[PDB]
Amino acid sequence: HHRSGNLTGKTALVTGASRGIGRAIAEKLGYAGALVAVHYATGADAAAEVAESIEKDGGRAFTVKAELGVPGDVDVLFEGLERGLKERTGATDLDILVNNAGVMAMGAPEEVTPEMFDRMMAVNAKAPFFIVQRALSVMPDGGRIINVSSGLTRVASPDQVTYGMSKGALEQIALHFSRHLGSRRITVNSVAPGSTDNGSALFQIPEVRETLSQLSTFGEVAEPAAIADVVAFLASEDARWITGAFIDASGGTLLG
Amino acid sequence: GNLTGKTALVTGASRGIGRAIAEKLGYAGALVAVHYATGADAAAEVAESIEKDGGRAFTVKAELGVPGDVDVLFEGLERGLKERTGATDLDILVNNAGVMAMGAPEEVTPEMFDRMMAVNAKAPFFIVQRALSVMPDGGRIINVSSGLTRVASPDQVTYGMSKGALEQIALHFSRHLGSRRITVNSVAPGSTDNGSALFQIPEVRETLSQLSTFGEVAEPAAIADVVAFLASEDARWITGAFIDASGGTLLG
Amino acid sequence: GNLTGKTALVTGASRGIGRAIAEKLGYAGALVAVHYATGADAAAEVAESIEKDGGRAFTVKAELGVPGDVDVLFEGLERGLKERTGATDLDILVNNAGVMAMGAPEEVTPEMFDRMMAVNAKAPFFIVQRALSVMPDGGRIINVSSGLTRVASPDQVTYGMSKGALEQIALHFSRHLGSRRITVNSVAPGSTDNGSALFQIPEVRETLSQLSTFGEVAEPAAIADVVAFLASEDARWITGAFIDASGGTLLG
Amino acid sequence: HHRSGNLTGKTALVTGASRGIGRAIAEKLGYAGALVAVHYATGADAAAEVAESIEKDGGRAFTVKAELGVPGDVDVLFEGLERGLKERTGATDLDILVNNAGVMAMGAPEEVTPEMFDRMMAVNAKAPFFIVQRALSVMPDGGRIINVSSGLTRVASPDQVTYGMSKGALEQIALHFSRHLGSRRITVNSVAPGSTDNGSALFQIPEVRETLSQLSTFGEVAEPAAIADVVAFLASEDARWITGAFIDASGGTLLG
Ligand SMILES: NC(=O)c1ccc[n+]([C@@H]2O[C@H](COP(=O)([O-])OP(=O)(O)OC[C@H]3O[C@@H](n4cnc5c(N)ncnc54)[C@H](OP(=O)(O)O)[C@@H]3O)[C@@H](O)[C@H]2O)c1
Ligand SMILES: NC(=O)c1ccc[n+]([C@@H]2O[C@H](COP(=O)([O-])OP(=O)(O)OC[C@H]3O[C@@H](n4cnc5c(N)ncnc54)[C@H](OP(=O)(O)O)[C@@H]3O)[C@@H](O)[C@H]2O)c1
Ligand SMILES: NC(=O)c1ccc[n+]([C@@H]2O[C@H](COP(=O)([O-])OP(=O)(O)OC[C@H]3O[C@@H](n4cnc5c(N)ncnc54)[C@H](OP(=O)(O)O)[C@@H]3O)[C@@H](O)[C@H]2O)c1
Ligand SMILES: NC(=O)c1ccc[n+]([C@@H]2O[C@H](COP(=O)([O-])OP(=O)(O)OC[C@H]3O[C@@H](n4cnc5c(N)ncnc54)[C@H](OP(=O)(O)O)[C@@H]3O)[C@@H](O)[C@H]2O)c1
Ligand SMILES: Cc1cc(O)c2c(c1)CC(=O)C1=C2C(=O)c2cccc(O)c2C1=O
Ligand SMILES: Cc1cc(O)c2c(c1)CC(=O)C1=C2C(=O)c2cccc(O)c2C1=O
Ligand SMILES: Cc1cc(O)c2c(c1)CC(=O)C1=C2C(=O)c2cccc(O)c2C1=O
Ligand SMILES: Cc1cc(O)c2c(c1)CC(=O)C1=C2C(=O)c2cccc(O)c2C1=O
């Protein structure tokens, strides 16, 4: 059985869609009718469960494996993407791109090594750029690019400086590419979540779930669905006049 | 629609962007109060248009920027909402009504400045203040700003000032209203065809079209679609935010 | 000093930050007009203090936010400048005078709102407008804002709104005045000891000290030093800018 | 003969101080009395001429060679810096750090290679981070860190996206380090020049000196001295209440 919505007929790639925010994004886009390529690095069982969840709810989805931040990453990602799309649609067209996959590594600024710096930049900033560069060859007019940033680009947090740097680089993609792609009517935007419960063990550290909840003006951490809802909107026809924007989905974390 | 059971006030809803907002909120299930100053026939067209497509709407007259304005507005609003729903509850507030008066800054009189500030900043503040007594948890406040708070134009400086004051409402009330889960946000359209004869003059249309990265002026619906999303459950985690709905006008 | 041969108006110069600004501009060589509302004895102390250290200064009385305010100000200013220099040329304008009135937003009256807007936004706009007729090329306009335009505080919302309007002056007039090489900029102090008895209450001082990343409230001189730089030749390539002089208050 | 000013007794490092903006920064800081370490990669003759110019005007300066963006770069930079400082002052203390050195490589977004990306990031963002990390061990309280960004982080320019990304990363240093260093009273700020005539050949392309001049509200490109004057201010006692700030020295380029 197939369910129809505002994205029926469209195709989407959500990077790191096996858990947390990316999972909720994929589910929401699939629910809306988009054929969703559910990307992962090593969590294939989690990805399959997301893809199945979409398919069971009457949507369409498949999984693609790609380790990002290593040589040949984009090549591997697009080989699997295009194959799955061509198989299911008879074409390689990609309408919606969500750059969600990312890494974090807390620590004192004095302990950051060049290797740690390289990894952060490689996964959070370089890969999103080259994924965008590659998607342009297969993205039709009226397409969508959404990059998942962080409110940590607007709040000083010494233990997260490397991560903030990476996301501040990522935010520059929306600015410069929105102008580049204007005549093709492809919108490029950044969405900045605040603290969001991704399920991970480090959110179940009892000295962490506190203070994080105090960041938001609402006094809670976000559910991933709250962020997914914003991304789904940006991917839609209703967000056609928004491009090159920084979209604050932090639940009032950026209030100073 | 996702706004079934909700109520909404859209100020300046008789024409232009406010009309599109009211029409889009009605379609989604909200009982819309269509506000106007002197466009009585126009407001009634919008209210009828909402009812026609299966929704519920009514009109409320209030000239803003003069003493007792908010009193008049909320007298008409609460009376109409109670007659229709049995409560004075206001879920959604859109501060859309506004004036513009372009001209050299050397020529701005104090009275022009008072008028600009009275309608674009003061009234929205006192409208928000009065709405707090009737707005349930999970409510929505949306203030229509302008890209001109980020793009320098000497001819529009007092307009800019008024909208910069308006934008402060979202910042400060978001913190105030956090524990009631009422979101407060600013929306900034770019150049938008409001139906006025101005946007039909080919040479004015061409200059304005060039401001957006798309090479077009916006249709009102494009702005309404953004406001409709902010009013919804889907934007529960967006508060105190500046939302750029300018179609790439603010790219420098 | 680097301001020798220059003239300067500092509004609200009888006390606090404006006093420090006037004292620092005088020391650098500017003929300073020390403006006040009712602090006549205080203004005279500042003017004397400038002359004592080898500079030139005088006082100008004007209650702002009431009709004819700018007329009174510029009558006194241009008369005093002409008597002292032989011209009415005004090189440096600092819009520093301001009021604050903290309190719950539910309790803001329209008259409180008018007062706030009249003194903090309207007067600075009409002061800039009148200054344009007497300001030579290479001139300077500096508007004292506040970190509260970037930090949400319900108790300060109308203050915030007024300062958000003020900040629009720099954006739009910078473009207007580009070909005259007159720079227009906003400066935002953080919590600053203005000499008032408020900053002596230990528990108020402690709370305010915590806002800065330095754990201290600012001395007025720290703000004046920033304004002094903007007024100088060294800041010729800074226009239309928001200058954060808050000591790390705006770090989120 | 020695000239005295507001920075007498202080020491400064200006990266890429052999030409353009860095040269003007060094001259201005030296003129103010700071002992200036004039850094360069391959332009040793230009650096010596800057260091001599400062010394002739009654200041103190020496040159340090270091290629940034390659392994061991920071090690090499600090070996030469500390040696020169210890020789001249008897201590390794560094009061003022200016991260000025940087690269640019225009081009269509579709032509950017990973190697081009790596180089941009390595020189403009990574090296500034590790230079800051290393300077902290030798920077006394009341110190200064100034990073030279660009107005290109606020103006969309498709041909410069990689460069914008690098500078957007660089701007995150000021935000996170200002909070980290608050109790040590070290200020960390970003300064964003607009178009500035650095002398380079690419500024003498006649199809380039046009349009660039139109960026500023003043209708000219900046002289390097105009930017240096802003940096000198930030390095001074008068800028003690400014930290974590983005300082717009673009001559009204950011007006939209
Ligand atoms: N959580 C927050 O509070 C929060 C706040 C603001 C912003 N964000 C951002 O939101 C995005 C997702 O956050 P999250 O908390 O949901 O993350 P998450 O739970 O840790 O999951 C990260 C996702 O990225 C994938 N991934 C990680 N490294 C990868 C790599 N090298 N190559 C390919 N895929 C990789 C993971 O795949 P596998 O299953 O194979 O490991 C997973 O699907 C990130 O960009 C994060 O920066 C999160
Ligand atoms: N159009 C654009 O390009 C554009 C761009 C950016 C932002 N905006 C902003 O978006 C909002 C609407 O713009 P627009 O072009 O659609 O409006 P436009 O047609 O003037 O429509 C104005 C609406 O506001 C009402 N109004 C005006 N003054 C009023 C007053 N003093 N008291 C009560 N109502 C008053 C008018 O009522 P009546 O019909 O009774 O006179 C009308 O409904 C404004 O805030 C404007 O600043 C517009
Ligand atoms: N202090 C802070 O923590 C702080 C922080 C951020 C921003 N600011 C801003 O910096 C500026 C000065 O602050 P402050 O604390 O130093 O001032 P504070 O002592 O009140 O001093 C006010 C000054 O402005 C004058 N003034 C007030 N109302 C006036 C009016 N209606 N017409 C003409 N003059 C009037 C006063 O004149 P008289 O002596 O004649 O009454 C006095 O000279 C203000 O714009 C304020 O918003 C202050
Ligand atoms: N020019 C503009 O309009 C403009 C506008 C905004 C921002 N900026 C920024 O201002 C800063 C300086 O600009 P500029 O135009 O003066 O640059 P410039 O004339 O090209 O000189 C660059 C300086 O950086 C050094 N350098 C380059 N690569 C290096 C490396 N890999 N390792 C160590 N040093 C290296 C050069 O040393 P050598 O002499 O040995 O080659 C030189 O001293 C840059 O960060 C640039 O991004 C410039
Ligand atoms: C273990 C851990 C440490 C953190 O420092 C954060 C988180 C986890 C969640 C997260 O990624 C974030 C923050 C965060 O403060 C923080 C502070 C201010 C804004 C914001 O978005 C964040 C944020 O997203
Ligand atoms: C007659 C007239 C003059 C204007 O100056 C505008 C308009 C009409 C339409 C309008 O309201 C706007 C602009 C506008 O430039 C302009 C410039 C930059 C941003 C922006 O939103 C606008 C804008 O919304
Ligand atoms: C009684 C009183 C209440 C205040 O709320 C402030 C002050 C006094 C001093 C003051 O003017 C300021 C603040 C302030 O928080 C505050 C919060 C965040 C930024 C900021 O600049 C300020 C600020 O300048
Ligand atoms: C060859 C060349 C191309 C450029 O694109 C720029 C420059 C040289 C000088 C430069 O680095 C800059 C810009 C620039 O537009 C530009 C546009 C808007 C702001 C800004 O700072 C710049 C800018 O600094």
Side-chain angles (χ1 to χ4, degrees), chain B residues 55-85:
Chain B
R56 284 217 289 179
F58 69 100
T59 73
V60 173
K61 172 173 162 62
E63 160 74 16
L64 304 170
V66 295
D69 51 353
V70 176
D71 291 314
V72 169
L73 172 60
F74 279 75
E75 176 156 66
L77 177 69
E78 298 175 19
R79 188 167 295 148
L81 294 173
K82 197 179 165 199
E83 176 200 308
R84 285 169 182 80
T85 74

Side-chain angles (χ1 to χ4, degrees), chain C residues 12-17 35-39 62-64 96-99 115 119 144-146 159 163 189-192 194 199:
Chain C
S14 64
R15 61 185 93 274
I17 294 168
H35 159 265
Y36 67 96
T38 54
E63 160 74 16
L64 304 170
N96 169 85
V99 302
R115 183 62 183 164
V119 175
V144 180
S145 197
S146 169
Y159 178 88
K163 294 293 191 175
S191 189
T192 306
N194 55 18
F199 288 88

Side-chain angles (χ1 to χ4, degrees), chain A residues 144-195:
Chain A
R144 298 282 187 271
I145 306 177
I146 298 134
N147 303 314
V148 183
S149 188
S150 169
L152 276 173
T153 65
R154 300 304 193 273
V155 185
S157 322
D159 279 8
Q160 307 264 47
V161 56
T162 281
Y163 175 89
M165 290 182 76
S166 75
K167 295 293 195 175
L170 173 72
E171 290 180 8
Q172 291 287 301
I173 292 163
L175 176 66
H176 302 284
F177 278 104
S178 67
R179 183 158 269 167
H180 188 56
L181 301 170
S183 75
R184 284 168 65 170
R185 302 302 197 267
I186 292 169
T187 72
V188 199
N189 291 299
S190 310
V191 52
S195 284

Side-chain angles (χ1 to χ4, degrees), chain A residues 15-22 39-44 46 66-69 99-103 119 123-124 148-151 163 167 192-198 200 203:
Chain A
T15 67
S18 54
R19 62 193 78 258
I21 296 179
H39 161 270
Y40 67 93
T42 63
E67 169 71 11
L68 302 174
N99 278 302
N100 170 85
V103 294
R119 183 62 185 174
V123 177
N124 295 356
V148 183
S149 188
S150 169
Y163 175 89
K167 295 293 195 175
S195 284
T196 310
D197 196 320
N198 55 19
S200 81
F203 264 84

Side-chain angles (χ1 to χ4, degrees), chain B residues 12 14-15 17 37-39 62 64 96 115 145 159 163 190 192 194:
Chain B
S14 64
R15 61 185 93 274
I17 294 168
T38 54
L64 304 170
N96 169 85
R115 183 62 183 164
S145 197
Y159 178 88
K163 294 293 191 175
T192 306
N194 55 18

Side-chain angles (χ1 to χ4, degrees), chain C residues 28 81 83 95 122 135 182 223 248:
Chain C
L81 294 173
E83 176 200 308
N95 274 308
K122 187 171 165 196
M135 178 161 287
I182 292 161
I223 313 307

Side-chain angles (χ1 to χ4, degrees), chain A residues 235-248:
Chain A
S236 82
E237 161 78 359
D238 305 67
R240 69 195 173 287
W241 229 243
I242 306 178
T243 192
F246 172 87
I247 301 294
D248 179 356

